Design brief:
By secondary structure, this protein is mainly alpha-helical. 31% of the residues lie in helices and 6% in strands. Bound molecules: chloride ion (CL) and sodium ion. Sodium ion binds next to loops. It is classed as hydrolase.
Length: 129
């Protein structure tokens, strides 16, 4: 599912991501543009051989099992495939756990490299609040 910007925001707001561990909704919508261009199906390979899955691009080495990543911990007890669905719930439950892992949203390199230090409100400007 390819989301619209405000469509994603409402879905992320309904799941309570807003100020979860102190990150305004804009931080999350911004993470989801640049991680995946708003697409629940995007999958990408990392060098270390791990793959990043879905809307926020949750990684298989720690976070979900894909069966091809040595040493996977499957810290969300989940199949990485289930994070590609159109029902962002599993990706949020897991994202709540990652962000809570101490380094905050810096767990997302596109958040660090592109969202952080910016006016993350442009990402919800025009969303019906
Ligand atoms: Cl933090
Ligand atoms: Na894993």
């Amino acid at each position: 599912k390819v989301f619209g910007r405000c469509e994603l925001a409402a879905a992320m707001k309904r799941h309570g991501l807003d100020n979860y561990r102190g990150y305004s909704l804009g931080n999350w919508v911004c993470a989801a543009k640049f991680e995946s261009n708003f697409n629940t199906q995007a999958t990408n390979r990392n060098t270390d051989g791990s793959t990043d899955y879905g809307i926020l691009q949750i990684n298989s080495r720690w976070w979900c099992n894909d069966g091809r990543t040595p040493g996977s911990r499957n810290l969300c007890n989940i199949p990485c495939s289930a994070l590609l669905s159109s029902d962002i719930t599993a990706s949020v439950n897991c994202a709540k756990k990652i962000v809570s892992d101490g380094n905050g949203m810096n767990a997302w390199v596109a958040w660090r490299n592109r969202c952080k230090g910016t006016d993350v409100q442009a990402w919800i400007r025009g969303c019906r609040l």
